[PDB]
Amino acid sequence: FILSQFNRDVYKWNFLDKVIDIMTTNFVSNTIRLLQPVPPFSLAGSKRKFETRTVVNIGEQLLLDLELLKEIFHTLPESVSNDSDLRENTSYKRVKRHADNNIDQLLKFIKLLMAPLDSADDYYETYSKLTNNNPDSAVWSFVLALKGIPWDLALWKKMWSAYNLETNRDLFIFKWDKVLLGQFENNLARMQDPNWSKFVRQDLK
Ligand SMILES: [Ba+2]
Ligand SMILES: [Ba+2]
Ligand SMILES: [Ba+2]
């Protein structure tokens, strides 16, 4: 027997939990659809829709969006409370920590999109910092592609070498749109160029 399903108070907080995740997912999906590379991938079937400098600017704008979002989240609890004696609820805090948690991730994700690509080393320092040392190469790649880098194998290896040299599955921000990452992975294996083909299957995997 399950009694919590008939409790209006338990529900309202679960609902805010859902609103939170919905908004987080939209923020993530829109960002990716915006910035992601257009299949088929190659130096042809290109240039990239945006230069990396512009992606950085975009990142900057998302920070202001993220800020407004944060405020919306801090506001949700007030929508379910007529009684605002809020030292509790052991449930309210759960909601607050949840909002705070999602914002942090977004923040990292964006901070990461805004990172410069001047040195492969400096980029590694911040990539591992911001993803908590995520060893996944597909994630790494999607991120880099999202950053706006063109399909320059020389530059990719330039970037990758530093990463590789220093490095259950953690999908980072893609926790929120597994499918887009999956498609990205597929498109990447479908590259016609033999070098790329070899770079993908042997160097990245
Ligand atoms: Ba600028
Ligand atoms: Ba109220
Ligand atoms: Ba290694």
UniProtKB/Swiss-Prot annotation:
Domain of life: Eukaryota
Cell location: Golgi apparatus, trans-Golgi network membrane; Endosome membrane
Function noted in UniProt: Involved in retrograde transport from early and late endosomes to late Golgi by linking the vesicle through the t-SNARE TGL1 to the Golgi, leading to the membrane fusion between late Golgi and endosomal vesicles.
Family: Belongs to the VPS53 family.
Subunit structure: Component of the Golgi-associated retrograde protein (GARP) complex, also called VFT (VPS fifty-three) complex, composed of VPS51, VPS52, VPS53 and VPS54. Also interacts with TLG1, YPT6 and ARL1.
Protein name: Vacuolar protein sorting-associated protein 53
Species name: Saccharomyces cerevisiae (strain ATCC 204508 / S288c) (Baker's yeast)
Gene name tied to this protein: VPS53
